[PDB]
From a paper:
In line with the result of MALS, the IBD proteins form a homodimer in both of the apo and itaconate bound states.
The bacterial protein ItcR is unique in its ability to bind to itaconate. Here, we report the development of a highly responsive, genetically encoded itaconate fluorescent biosensor, referred to as BioITA (biosensor for itaconate).
Author numbering:
A (entry chain C): 86 to 292
B (entry chain D): 89 to 292
Write the structure that this text describes.
Amino acid sequence: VRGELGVLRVGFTASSAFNSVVPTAIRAFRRAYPDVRLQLEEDNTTRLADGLNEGSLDVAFLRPGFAGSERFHLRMLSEEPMMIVMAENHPAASYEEISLSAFRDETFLLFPREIGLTLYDSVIESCRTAGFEPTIGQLAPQIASVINLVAAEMGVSIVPASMSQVKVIGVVYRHIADQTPTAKLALAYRRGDTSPVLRNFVLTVFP
Amino acid sequence: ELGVLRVGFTASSAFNSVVPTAIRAFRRAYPDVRLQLEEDNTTRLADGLNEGSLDVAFLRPGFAGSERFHLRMLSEEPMMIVMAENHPAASYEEISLSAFRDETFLLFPREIGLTLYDSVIESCRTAGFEPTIGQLAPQIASVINLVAAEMGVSIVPASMSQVKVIGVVYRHIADQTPTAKLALAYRRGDTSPVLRNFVLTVFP
């Protein structure tokens, strides 16, 4: 009965929310352990890291490949293909499978590097791997914000595959035929945490 | 026909097609104007109209200081309800608001905006209860994802139902509610021809 009562702080990143595993993780756990009071905090991967260090978070969903990652339990959760979101009318939705080289001279909308550090450097690298430096467009607040801006035919973007559940009119998500760098997702917690509540949560994702 | 025009809009309106459609269309007709988009909530939108940083805004009418501007109504969409897919309420064809009295509501003023947030609260009260507000702490944009996680139920503009997050469903509200309104606003007496091309493109 250890740890079936108390309070757990769960953090996750803005676009990781859209990945179906965070809502599932949370929903499963709130079933087994109704009595435990959750506390959800959505934030930057470095925010989630700092807060796990601080004691202000107990478990986080976050994108591995951050500096100092060799300080926590990092358990690989999810790997997802990255897809290009354009406007429906765009010339290139006509091509079946999209090569990123066809978007050299486009304006690439993106989140700020501080706003999404891990996703960004891999987004640029695919363009680079595709043989051009992307022209950065208008900075937008959240991953969903850029999708509506694509609907307004303002740019193309690259999003995790789980954003293709934002079915705004007038955008489409296509698949790149290059490296298709993925979006990794990892369950991260504190090394040495003997909380039972934490493992009640950590085994929920890993039964 | 030349210059820059500064356009602004609420995060939530960008799901209502009128905003992409009116931008996409103007961008076609007038490629020489450099569009500048500022996504922000209505109160700062008006602020930017006043201090001069914004020349038109898509926003929610009936705010205070709304007589210092021009506002022409653009759309009105009903507000629906998002709930987790294995909710008891999923199974009713038409749902009421009464049936959520003891329920947990997930409103975040940041995502939806004051004017919408308070009216949804008002709406519950008209049903016959004070809605028990879910998470005050660390407000995060996008409730649908906490609704997929069975943490509550939220009320969102009909536009938002294009967010087909797995594990949520959306249903219409049989209780007569207030709807989600959107105006289009510019300063009184702005005498730009570039500004007028934006308004005419929205209201042709």
